[PDB]
Amino acid sequence: AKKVQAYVKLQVAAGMANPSPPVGPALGQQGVNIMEFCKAFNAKTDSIEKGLPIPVVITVYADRSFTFVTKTPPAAVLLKKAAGIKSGSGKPNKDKVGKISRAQLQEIAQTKAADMTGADIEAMTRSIEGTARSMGLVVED
Amino acid sequence: MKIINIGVLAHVDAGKTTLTESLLYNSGAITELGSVDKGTTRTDNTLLERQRGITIQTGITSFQWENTKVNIIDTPGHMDFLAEVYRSLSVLDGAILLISAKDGVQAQTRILFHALRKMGIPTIFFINKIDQNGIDLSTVYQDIKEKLSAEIVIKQKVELYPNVCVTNFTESEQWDTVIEGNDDLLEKYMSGKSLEALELEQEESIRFQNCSLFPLYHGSAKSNIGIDNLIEVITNKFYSSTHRGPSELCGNVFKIEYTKKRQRLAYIRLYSGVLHLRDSVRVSEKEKIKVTEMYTSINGELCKIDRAYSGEIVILQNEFLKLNSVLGDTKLLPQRKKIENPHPLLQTTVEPSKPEQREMLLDALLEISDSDPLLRYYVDSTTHEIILSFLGKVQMEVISALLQEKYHVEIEITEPTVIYMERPLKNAEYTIHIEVPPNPFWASIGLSVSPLPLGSGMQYESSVSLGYLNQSFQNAVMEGIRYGCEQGLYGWNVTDCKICFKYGLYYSPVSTPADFRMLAPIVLEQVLKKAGTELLEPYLSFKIYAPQEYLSRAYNDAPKYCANIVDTQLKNNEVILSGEIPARCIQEYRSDLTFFTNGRSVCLTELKGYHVTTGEPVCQPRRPNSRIDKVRYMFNKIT
Amino acid sequence: VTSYIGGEGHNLQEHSVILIRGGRVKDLPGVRYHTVRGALDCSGVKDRKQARSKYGVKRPKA
Amino acid sequence: TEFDVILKAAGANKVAVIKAVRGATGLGLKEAKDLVESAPAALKEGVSKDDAEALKKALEEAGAEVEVK
């Protein structure tokens, strides 16, 4: 389990094959080819829904290519299609931009549990639901 | 008979051209001063050369050794205007670059060393300044292997100390890997057993023709140890001269300089045959052009000769001589060339001093075209501002120093034309009126310019219906609108035009097609006043290559540069990135890669994208316009 | 002298040494000469056809 | 993946072995020839069996012997 070397968690939507206006040089900052982030980046994207920004480990090695393990998309972009509104924070406590409820957000929580580190599902419920409070959203308990 | 010309690739101010002056003493005398420290003769030639510490252009001197001719010239490696040294590669297939003793061969010489591969002619490294402290007697020589990027090995090596052994080597046991590549030498390696090194010199002689590896060399010329015996190898290692005399004679020009005592002399090597003195010959102009005089360029002094040998190179006077002109025709040789990869290395103004004496300086600018061929200039600007194609910092000093001696004029300029392309900010109603409120001509039309996306250029359409649009007179309206696109109210050139003309009442008995052309220009200066002005500047992209270790230092230059970041990809140890910065500040970008790059910097770009726009104040360059009919009436429109 | 520039346009600017022929223009005051188009750096008028011996234009290649 | 790549002999095509060994470590042709006189000797150690199988199979085209380890 080697520590830090060159890996980063930054790329936009998974449906955007071979990004450049977003990431651009940042992924090409190492010796890895720009072609590596579309021909292989989509090899796992095809398994699930396209267009969802999913972070992935990029542990570059001297031997041309690199190992990688896909993770879980952030809950911020998850609060769009499942929340209706594409907006978020900006005006948190000053006004209610939207609201969902605990019956639904807790139902999505265990799908992300494969990446989350929690002793119990209830402990991982409010840590995700508490991120929507930063958005000004008011969960319906 | 003859002999190939020796090289002189003293890259990064290696002073290997100053080692050539020591070779003239070894070929001496029987009567010569023997050279001296500093300047110093050594075929210095033009004035203000050795006083500058380095020659303004590559020279030449006569010499011989081993019962063979051994012409050579140096250095051309200073700066800065190194493309001129590329023209000397045609003077001789030989090479003899002097790698520096400080950290291996200088990186600027690696560009001239990689250019030697494109020549297709052999070259050899030499241990210049071997008698000095910090020299890489066993460490820096390994750096020439990493920089050579091949398998060249020295034929001898020593470490000192007062000793300067050279023949004691070399490359025992392991040496001879180049023979392994030979189809014949690789078969002798299969037989095994020891063999004489002269036997491997035949297979190395085949590989020397392909220039597969630089011949070995060592010993600084200042120590006077190995600077003469190593010169004997140039006689045997150099390729034999292509003697013939069978005819018909052929050749091509190589270089020329406007000597004050000349006044002209376009020297050129004889590719084949020989030219009798005072006899006509063929040329590229397709006319007769006898050589009335010609002489060999002796290192100690010029010397006439009744006829050049075959394969020789010597100056000769003529009434005219285009650069690279066939002495046949025609020469049949092919090679790659470039002016250091730069169509324009930061143009700078050089307006001459004095209201009249500056004009005679313009004719001296034609004399710069008689010198180095990598030079160009044109008065494209309406002010006739100078725009020389020469680039580099120290290289400009020779062009400025030349003005203080060869002529009597000088100038200082650098900003250049701003290249503004102002566009209207928004579309607005306008009209030239009707009848005679009013001023000439009585014909009028209501121009209605509108905004357009950047880079779309000028546009117009004939909205008026016939016959009032005029099948013939309506075209003057467009030709007259174009007169108003030569400059806006701030004098900036018209951009993003979209003048869709509409109303155009006119009286027939007094109307003329010039009358509509005249009122049309006023519709463009009135409708441009409603635009409120919109200054914009070009922002062409400028890709550049920098070493990855210094690549992090190139991001600091980004905040100072007006350009925004762009995509780039690494390429092994080399690195590059796609920039895009405005041309007003792009000329200063070259200074940034010469410093932060440490000499490894390299870049290239070209103008593109009319869109830009930047602050502040929206300054404009006067003035537009004058020397045109009815121009004083546009002043009445202001009030 | 202030010789008139004949033909349609010219590449001349500021200096540009040119040959000068005689003959008054019978129109511009102060002018009694004509510029020799097609001589020296004074290039001839583009795409001339009839009367091309004047202005120095050459016989077309096509 | 650390099989030996010992070379028992250069074989009847010992000249061809000098190229397969020279490209096996970037060693010089002079040392690559004295190593032929140093036979038997390992050409490499710790290398993956996928790599040494290519350098060994190339020795089969030269008629030379090899000894995997």
UniProtKB/Swiss-Prot annotation, chain A:
The modification N,N,N-trimethylalanine is found at residue 1. GO terms for molecular function: large ribosomal subunit rRNA binding; rRNA binding; structural constituent of ribosome. The modification N6-succinyllysine is found at residues 71, 80. Gene3D superfamilies: Ribosomal protein L11, C-terminal domain, Ribosomal protein L11/L12, N-terminal domain. The modification N6,N6,N6-trimethyllysine is found at residues 3, 39. It comes from the Bacteria. One of its GO terms (cellular component) is cytoplasm. Keywords: Methylation, Ribonucleoprotein, Ribosomal protein, RNA-binding, rRNA-binding. One of its GO terms (biological process) is translation. PANTHER family: 60S RIBOSOMAL PROTEIN L12, LARGE RIBOSOMAL SUBUNIT PROTEIN UL11M. Belongs to the universal ribosomal protein uL11 family. Forms part of the ribosomal stalk which helps the ribosome interact with GTP-bound translation factors. NCBIfam families: L11_bact (TIGR01632). Part of the ribosomal stalk of the 50S ribosomal subunit. Interacts with L10 and the large rRNA to form the base of the stalk. L10 forms an elongated spine to which 2 L12 dimers bind in a sequential fashion forming a pentameric L10(L12)2(L12)2 complex. This is Large ribosomal subunit protein uL11. It comes from Escherichia coli (strain K12).
Curated annotation (Swiss-Prot), chain B:
One of its GO terms (molecular function) is GTPase activity. Keywords: Antibiotic resistance, GTP-binding, Nucleotide-binding, Protein biosynthesis, Transposable element. Residues 1-242 form the tr-type G domain. It comes from the Bacteria. PROSITE patterns: G_TR_1, G_TR_2. GTP binds at residues 10-17, 74-78, 128-131. Pfam families: EF-G_D2 (PF22042), EFG_C (PF00679), EFG_III (PF14492), EFG_IV (PF03764), GTP_EFTU (PF00009). GO terms for biological process: response to antibiotic; ribosome disassembly; translation. Abolishes the inhibitory effect of tetracyclin on protein synthesis by a non-covalent modification of the ribosomes. Belongs to the TRAFAC class translation factor GTPase superfamily. Classic translation factor GTPase family. TetM/TetO subfamily. PANTHER family: RIBOSOME-RELEASING FACTOR 2, MITOCHONDRIAL, TRANSLATION ELONGATION FACTOR G-RELATED. This is Tetracycline resistance protein TetM from transposon Tn916. It comes from Enterococcus faecalis (Streptococcus faecalis).
Swiss-Prot record, chain C:
Keywords: Acetylation, Antibiotic resistance, Methylation, Ribonucleoprotein, Ribosomal protein, RNA-binding, rRNA-binding, tRNA-binding. GO terms for biological process: cytoplasmic translation; Group I intron splicing; maintenance of translational fidelity; positive regulation of RNA splicing; response to antibiotic; RNA folding; translation. GO terms for cellular component: cytoplasm; cytosol; cytosolic small ribosomal subunit; ribosome. Disulfide bonds: none annotated. GO terms for molecular function: misfolded RNA binding; rRNA binding; structural constituent of ribosome; tRNA binding. The modification N6-acetyllysine is found at residue 46. The keyword RNA-binding applies. The modification 3-methylthioaspartic acid is found at residue 27. Part of the 30S ribosomal subunit. Contacts proteins S8 and S17. Interacts with ArfA. May interact with IF1 in the 30S initiation complex. Belongs to the universal ribosomal protein uS12 family. With S4 and S5 plays an important role in translational accuracy. At least 19 substitutions or deletions in 11 codons can promote streptomycin resistance, dependence or pseudodependence; all but one of the streptomycin resistant mutations (K42R) are associated with hyperaccurate translation and thus reduced translational efficiency. This is Small ribosomal subunit protein uS12. It comes from Escherichia coli (strain K12). The gene is rpsL.
Swiss-Prot record, chain D:
It comes from the Bacteria. GO terms for molecular function: mRNA binding; protein homodimerization activity; ribosome binding; structural constituent of ribosome. GO terms for cellular component: cytoplasm; cytosol; cytosolic large ribosomal subunit; large ribosomal subunit. Changing residue 22 to M: EF-Tu-binding and EF-Tu-promoted GTP hydrolysis reduced. Keywords: Acetylation, Methylation, Ribonucleoprotein, Ribosomal protein. Lys-30 was found to be 50% monomethylated. Transmembrane segments: none annotated. GO terms for biological process: cytoplasmic translation; translation. Residues 2-69 are annotated as: Required for recruitment of EF-Tu and EF-G, and for EF-Tu and EF-G-promoted GTP hydrolysis. The modification N6-methyllysine is found at residue 30. The keyword S-adenosyl-L-methionine does not apply. The keyword Transmembrane does not apply. Ribosomal protein L8 appears to be an aggregate of ribosomal proteins L7/L12 and L10. The binding site for several of the GTPase factors involved in protein synthesis (IF-2, EF-Tu, EF-G and RF3). Is thus essential for accurate translation. Deletion of 1 of the L12 dimers from the ribosome (by deleting the binding site on L10) leads to decreased IF-2 association with the 70S ribosome and decreased stimulation of the GTPase activity of EF-G. Belongs to the bacterial ribosomal protein bL12 family. This is Large ribosomal subunit protein bL12. It comes from Escherichia coli (strain K12). The lineage of its organism: Bacteria, Pseudomonadati, Pseudomonadota, Gammaproteobacteria, Enterobacterales.
